[PDB]
Symmetry: C5
């Protein structure tokens, strides 16, 4: 509710020259009243008359109706920024020491210097890549200051800090003026030509950080990073963070949580003295010195103060620094520079091959259908395939520039060009294009761009590999539904005064030219061993083709650009872009640690308690037959590093007894920590999202950060959403959508009216509007249909199906078509056509509805029904579980303190149902949860044919149809579908133990009848309600349910008719 | 305190109207204004909430949901930057193990639901909504409805209830002398409660389990969607958060899980009926006196359907009481066949956001 | 006036071009559409036995009463006669609508227990309801009242029809696939409405048969607890 | 052309401003959203055992078949294999779609009996179905076919997945709160789809647990028989 | 009242709950209009093509799965000349969610679709 009013301040603030609110309502009489009020308002304003009398004359509308949006009639130029900024340009502009960046262009020179001519300029090195403007950020920041220019006490101090800092930004920007952004939110050459090239991105990062300060320390930190970043743009993030790895080893462990036999976090009182060798301390001093010799002052001082007592109680600060260092921006260097950085392997490669074999040993001999029909599966998977060059195509009688790999298959099949048995050579003749991945505080890494023959020859094998990983704990990333918490508990588990932990950072090793030979040799060798295990042509064909991918790779040239020209150099290193990348990479990393660990054993005798891999990090807790001495840790670390050295591999091999740090999570003090640095006002790359989705994505990012540590002031975020959602109907009239429009659960929902809490239509208006929004949810694309009209699409679908179907498969057939018609929009002409057209419908939609033939039901409709049957009464819950994720906001942390947390994901795809397993056992097809849901809701007779249509044997198909297991399977499919619709696995809920004994007691539900469906929803609805109350009140409530037996049948029908609401931005899923 | 209702109607008339030109305002009608939706401002009779019973109300009801959530050309791009992706992933990496995306999808929207706050987003969404809203009143007739709500479910049950005049004596004294006579009359006959009706699923076994081990907290909606899943899927969800497998497996089968399926739905339904807010929070919905006025035979021990028929029965009787001063008794002969169709509908109800409706005072 | 004037802009534009709606909410329209295919209609006959007492009723309307009779009662369409409601009333003064009782009833036992406490029901008593068999039945009754409300079975001309007429009941044929009170209920009411409406628009009767599969009933059962409404109060025909 | 051109005006305006919709209809989106919160996901592992036979399938797609296998059959998605349908076919030539069978099945025994008669089924035979146990099961099967149709489980890439794979089934955990074939069915299918999709977008598997309360199941059961559709035929991927 | 009370409890009322839903569903599928009115939807021949196990005696869900099964098979027949057999393994958990949906289905008026000729 505060969002709608706040928006008024923002509009009045920006415009000084009318504001015509717009109210809608389910009530019919009120609605006409709303229209009268609206009509009179325009007339009064377009006649320069008051509006105070009208508002009094429509108190019913203000008080009883819903605000739909607020129109804004303006007539200036939106150049209020130039005028407002000057008041803050009092400070002295910053001067960048152009002598800081090893790479010339990394230095913050004058654009006209880095790019003398227009045809030479390229924002490719600083592009915020975000659909919001710098002026907007400046405008948004100014609005907050105007509003909090009179706050008192501590609130004021936040202002003084915010005021000070902002001045650095205002003062510097003012010197060169505020850069103007074009429709594409890019920054052209003329505006940029006389300004410090890295200005715009810097302002975003400085603004993002200064609007994230609260305590004094935040200020020094925001202040130091803000200033040094202006000149340093290549080591500030790396330097500020770097010491965090050594710091974790420093603190002891006073009580920590572990992983018990039931693989659930269990509080242990164990104590472990964090003992570190002398040399390790020096390593940390150098990190501090490097930080110091680089300009830093206060931040280094802070860590220094921390090291005097190294009290986990004062560790929170060390965390704020490591998280903050990331908000300095993205290191976007020239592609070539990024590309440029790139006998005793018998033991190493041997393990890689062997691991490959195990993952594919049983499947190969049996002649798994997946291996035999790998071509269809890979073909089907294309939707979840990488990306290829934006080729040229023709379908029917037109031309397009699609970059999606799946479409390439369509053009090629309908052109006799499709030839998967022949996987294009990736060498001098036909090199590999290139893609990239940027990340704060790390050298840019490149991404191959192999054709589709490569994905196809890799999907089945990798998929089969993963299943093995899925049940192997060594691969801490894949194992079961495991969440990062399980991984956290496993490490603390064996930690004792007779066991030292060892972590590494093999990121560079995965791209070390040295690595490619072994890596490829092992994969190919294993394929050879597997091939001499079967006599199946389909499998051997697949086993062989995969082998070739490695051979073509062994010698791969790269189409590396070097200006407006495309050079072409060699490349003896391995990069990402293959299916096997993430999976195979782990195999190698695991293979590497096994090799190093075994070799070091020659000297000291230990016991490998646990070994794990996780992308660019691999660790292990080894136990010693005696107490660990500083000398011992120093010796083992040396032996480990030298070993890594012998294999000529650049790595960060550290060793501790109580903590570990890695790219995804750091365990300092026995407590689990997560970094919180997701740049909010500077995106990595310019995707295909829209301004609206950009905002919902921004809010998602904000919540993840708040949950992890970093916290950008929510008022600022509200301001951005206000700027990002608004849309103009004229050149002097913008339409700012209301809070109800913005937060109501729909396909346009951007945020929540209370972070961490999701609401659902409870009032008539919310539902009235809720049903109304679904209407214009999916608007056809005058391209996505014609594409399915050409022989190409029809041949491709039929061609895929002809080898997938037998009977009348159309339920399956209808889905495949939309499977493509759902991604096809990607193609600019379709995403842009749909996005631009949506605005006309959306603008008109706010105008006048009242005419909708609703009939479809959703979670909103179902939940609204159950509400009246729940009787709430104050209940009490004591805090018993300790803390292990110290950064969690108090309200969130409180729930875990009372009901606990889970170290698992809640099955939300039906993957663990008997029917699914059967469909998988024989057919390669993979029906989504939605399909399983629709299929399960069918009659026994229909369901039986579905299985046959895919290939399940009739004896077996018939057994399922009757069997008791099928009935239960009907319950499980619904459960997965429901949980999916509640995002119970994403957001903050993924951190709550929804089966907590403590939470369960607070719910009271009598079994009117053994009806698993209804009993299930009443309970989950009961649990969510209690949790949400907890978050928004700090106190608990107990719910009672007396749902009549009659009502249950009506509700039961509703359960199998719930539709969805797409919006992917809501994505908060972080661990 | 009581401000004359006519005055309030006048304000709503002034506050809701919107201008399309400088000399043309569009005052929304009573049906548009009071029909239960995301734009619902009030009720056509204070203290009484209606639900689409006529074809027109439902026709318009499904139509309004359409333009309910309109994307923000800012709230999406924000999730497009490395910042949002890193923040979500960073939070998840220490929260997940398996394939958590059900949890992951929710977290993103958790932010995309508040992000609008930022003026450029709330204002952009609010201003854009007007164009869609104005046009919406113009011409619809083209909507691919398929989602069902409380309106659709309740509309189904109506025909199966047989109403007949009944009588209820006033026995409970007064203790909140200010309550308007029509409201006070209900308490005088059926009494009042000194408790809140569990409307979040907080008191369910699954929730407690998710809390006991994981710190995550899934809303009622998530518990509702999750509960509606297959035993196989639900088991992974618990693992994905951290619940121990020995314990996770015990819940999946256990009888308690089945009941928990009933309780999650109850909390979800009560939430959608605001049974805890408004004036209903002052009514003892389990009053012995109210219960007698309802007649429902157990066609089968199907806790879901028996539950809604009853609550629907109770609300109907209460509302009549408020708008008539006299009571009515309802009879229900819901066929066994109809119950299965209704049962499917129960696990597919969507919501309607409007937070203004907030009347929750004590 | 503001809502009414603004609605026109949206309404006019609405007729223009839609094709973009994220439907997910279900209503009576969606539920009934599902059941239709499972009903097998066949000509049946009903004799006129009840005399006339409201001579003004249009012949087509009067004909239904002549064959199946009429009621002198209203069909509980607010859940007022449910145990949970009575309990909420016995202790608290609050009065939750049918919609709220419907949403609340659709909740988990744990949540529902707190709701009662939150209003004031005593815990000893609140706990007794949550488990008790009566609560299960109450789940059925809340739904019945909600459904009847959505069918205006108490307003219009239907309020003059004895929907539990022995004569009407025979014309309907429904086997008990399972003691699932919810689905059996809707199939029946849907069966009754269909027969009555045919009577009004044809003067002759039809008999309906239902072979709803056991599998289909569970899908339908979910739909039942997710039906939304459609406000329009004008439809108000309730005269006696 | 008239519909297509007119749709543009409505569509353009639709993006502009909505906020005024009387939703009440429920769809798969609404039903699935409900079940999500009740599923507990946890990392699980699945080994590759089945060889390759369709070498072209993209690695992520091929991986699912390697672990859970594939089917050589289509999943009944029209209700064609139900007793009621066979009866309607045995005597009448009419052919009601899955939607009609779905709506008809959701009817009361009395109404369904007339439907059969109306088409020509003999009364002795029509009456036998209406009561018979087979009719109850038939209520389950009609829903199953309707649900599978809405999930395009037979089109797209899913048509290549063995959804009844023993390997996939183990990854799902669902306790029988009550022998309610409808809800148990959706929870399971929802469970299976979720696991499969995760597999495609991650290469690793997840195991799902479900503790759906008994109370929630009844609300969900109502929703099941009120799900509407979404026409778009382009989505047609059905190739083999 | 004596008679009204007898129905409210009576077993017949429970069944009546099933029948009302059946009629409502069939209406929404126009099973009586169009070309479907000429098809014996309870054909022994059509019934065999459908396979549905009784997860639980839940008449609502079993009903829709079956009708959905029958419509799918018939439609395939019309658009292919060949038949298909459908199998259904709907989990017990999913059935409850679906059961709720069943009692919340709304309509779609369009009377033109009227094909009812005999």
């Amino acid at each position: 509710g505060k969002y709608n009013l706040i928006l008024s301040e923002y509009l009045s603030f920006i415009y000084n020259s009318v504001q015509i609110p717009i109210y809608y309502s389910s009530n019919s009489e009120l609605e006409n009243r709303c229209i009268e009020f609206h009509s009179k308002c325009l007339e009064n304003s377009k006649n320069g008359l008051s509006l105070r009398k009208l508002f009094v004359e429509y108190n019913d509308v203000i008080e009883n109706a819903t605000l739909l949006s607020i129109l804004s009639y303006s007539y200036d130029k939106y150049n209020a920024v130039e005028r407002k900024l000057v008041k803050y340009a009092k400070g002295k502009p910053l001067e960048a020491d152009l002598t800081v960046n090893e790479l010339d262009y990394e230095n913050n020179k004058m654009t006209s210097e880095l790019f003398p001519t227009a045809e030479e300029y390229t924002d490719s090195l600083m592009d915020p890549a975000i659909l919001t403007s710098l002026s907007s950020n400046l405008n948004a920041v100014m609005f907050w200051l105007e509003k909090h220019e009179n706050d008192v006490a501590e609130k004021l101090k936040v202002y003084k800090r915010r005021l000070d800092l902002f001045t650095i930004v205002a003062s510097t920007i003012n010197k060169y003026g505020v850069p103007r952004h074009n429709a594409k939110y890019r920054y052209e050459y003329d505006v940029m030509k006389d300004k410090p090239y890295y200005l715009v991105t810097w302002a975003n990062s400085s603004i993002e950080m200064l609007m994230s300060v609260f305590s004094h320390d935040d200020y020094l930190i925001a202040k130091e990073l803000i200033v040094l970043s202006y000149s340093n743009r290549s080591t500030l993030a790396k330097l500020v963070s770097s010491p965090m790895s050594i710091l974790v080893a420093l603190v002891d462990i006073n009580g920590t949580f572990i992983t018990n036999e039931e693989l659930e976090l269990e509080f242990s009182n164990k104590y472990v003295r964090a003992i570190v060798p002398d040399q390790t301390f020096d390593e940390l001093n150098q990190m501090l010195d490097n930080m110091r010799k680089a300009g830093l002052v206060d931040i280094p001082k802070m860590i220094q103060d921390w090291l005097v007592d190294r009290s986990i109680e004062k560790f929170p600060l060390m965390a704020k620094i490591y998280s903050w260092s990331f908000h300095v921006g993205f290191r976007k260097q020239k592609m070539l520079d990024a590309a440029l950085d790139q006998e005793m392997y018998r033991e190493y490669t041997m393990l890689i091959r062997d691991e490959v074999v195990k993952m594919l040993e049983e499947p190969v001999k049996h002649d798994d259908h997946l291996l035999r029909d790998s071509e269809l599966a890979g073909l089907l998977s294309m939707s979840s395939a990488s990306n290829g060059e934006s080729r040229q195509l023709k379908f029917g009688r037109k031309t397009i520039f699609s970059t999606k790999k799946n479409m390439h298959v369509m053009d090629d099949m309908a052109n006799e060009r499709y030839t998967p048995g022949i996987i294009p050579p990736v060498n001098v003749d036909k090199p590999i294009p290139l893609g990239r991945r940027d990340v704060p505080g790390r050298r840019t890494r490149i991404i191959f761009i192999l054709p589709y023959e490569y994905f196809i020859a890799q999907h089945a094998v990798v998929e089969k590999m993963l299943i093995y990983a899925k049940h192997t704990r060594e691969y801490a990333e894949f194992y079961s539904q495991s969440n990062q918490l399980l991984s956290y508990g496993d490490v603390t588990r064996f930690l004792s005064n007779n066991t030292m932990v060892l972590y590494t950072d093999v990121s560079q090793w995965d791209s070390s030219q040295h690595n490619t030979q072994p890596f490829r040799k092992g994969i190919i060798m294993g394929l050879d061993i597997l091939a001499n295990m079967t006599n199946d042509a389909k499998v051997l064909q697949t086993l062989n083709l995969y082998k070739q991918t490695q051979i073509n790779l062994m010698d791969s040239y790269v189409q590396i650009p070097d200006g407006n020209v495309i050079k072409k150099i060699q490349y003896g290193a391995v990069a990402s872009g293959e299916k096997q990348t993430k999976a195979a990479n782990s195999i190698a990393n695991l293979a590497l640690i096994k090799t190093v660990l075994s070799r070091i054993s020659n000297k000291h005798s230990f016991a490998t308690k646990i070994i794990r891999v996780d992308g660019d990090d691999n660790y292990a807790v080894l136990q010693f037959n005696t107490e660990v001495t500083k000398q011992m840790i120093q010796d083992v670390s040396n032996d480990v590093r030298e070993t890594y050295a012998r294999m000529n591999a650049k790595v960060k091999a550290l060793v501790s007894t109580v903590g570990i740090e890695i790219a995804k999570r750091y365990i300092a003090g026995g407590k689990i920590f997560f970094r919180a640095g997701i740049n909010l006002l500077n995106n990595e790359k310019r995707g295909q999202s829209t301004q609206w989705d950009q905002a919902a994505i921004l809010y998602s990012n904000y919540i993840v950060n708040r949950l992890r540590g970093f916290e950008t002031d929510r008022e600022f975020i509200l301001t951005k959403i206000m700027q990002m959602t608004s849309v103009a109907i004229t050149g002097s009239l913008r339409l700012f959508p209301s809070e109800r429009v913005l937060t109501t659960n729909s396909t346009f929902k951007v945020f929540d009216s209370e972070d961490f809490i999701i609401e659902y239509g409870t009032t008539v208006d919310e539902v009235y509007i809720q049903r109304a929004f679904m209407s214009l949810s999916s608007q056809k694309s005058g391209i996505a249909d014609e594409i399915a009209a050409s022989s190409t699409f029809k041949n491709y679908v039929t061609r895929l199906s002809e080898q997938l179907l037998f009977s009348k498969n159309n339920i399956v057939s209808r889905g495949i078509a939309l499977t493509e018609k759902a991604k096809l929009n990607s193609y600019a002409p379709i995403s842009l056509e749909k996005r631009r057209a949506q605005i006309s419908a959306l603008l008109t939609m706010l105008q006048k509805p009242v005419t909708f033939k609703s009939s479809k039901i959703t979670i909103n409709d179902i939940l609204r029904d159950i509400k009246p049957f729940f009787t709430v009464s104050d209940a009490h819950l004591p805090i018993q579980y300790q803390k292990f994720m110290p950064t969690l906001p108090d309200n969130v942390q409180y729930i875990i303190q009372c009901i606990g947390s889970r170290t698992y994901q809640i099955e939300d795809d039906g993957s663990k149902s008997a029917i699914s397993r059967l469909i998988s056992k024989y057919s390669v097809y993979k029906p989504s949860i939605e399909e399983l849901y629709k299929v399960i809701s069918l009659h026994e007779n229909e369901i039986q044919l579905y299985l046959i249509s895919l290939g399940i044997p009739k004896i077996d198909a018939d057994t399922y149809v009757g069997s008791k297991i099928y009935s239960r399977d009907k319950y499980r499919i619904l459960e997965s579908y429901v949980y999916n619709l509640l995002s119970i696995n994403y957001g903050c809920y993924q951190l709550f133990d929804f089966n907590s004994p403590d939470l369960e007691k607070l719910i009271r539900i009598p079994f009117k009848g053994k009806i698993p469906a209804v009993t299930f929803i009443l309970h989950l609805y009961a649990k969510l309600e209690v949790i949400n109350y907890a978050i928004k009140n700090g106190s608990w409530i107990s719910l009672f349910c007396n749902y009549p037996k009659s009502e249950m049948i009506k509700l039961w029908k509703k359960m199998w008719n719930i539709t969805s609401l797409r919006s992917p931005y809501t994505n908060a899923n972080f661990f």
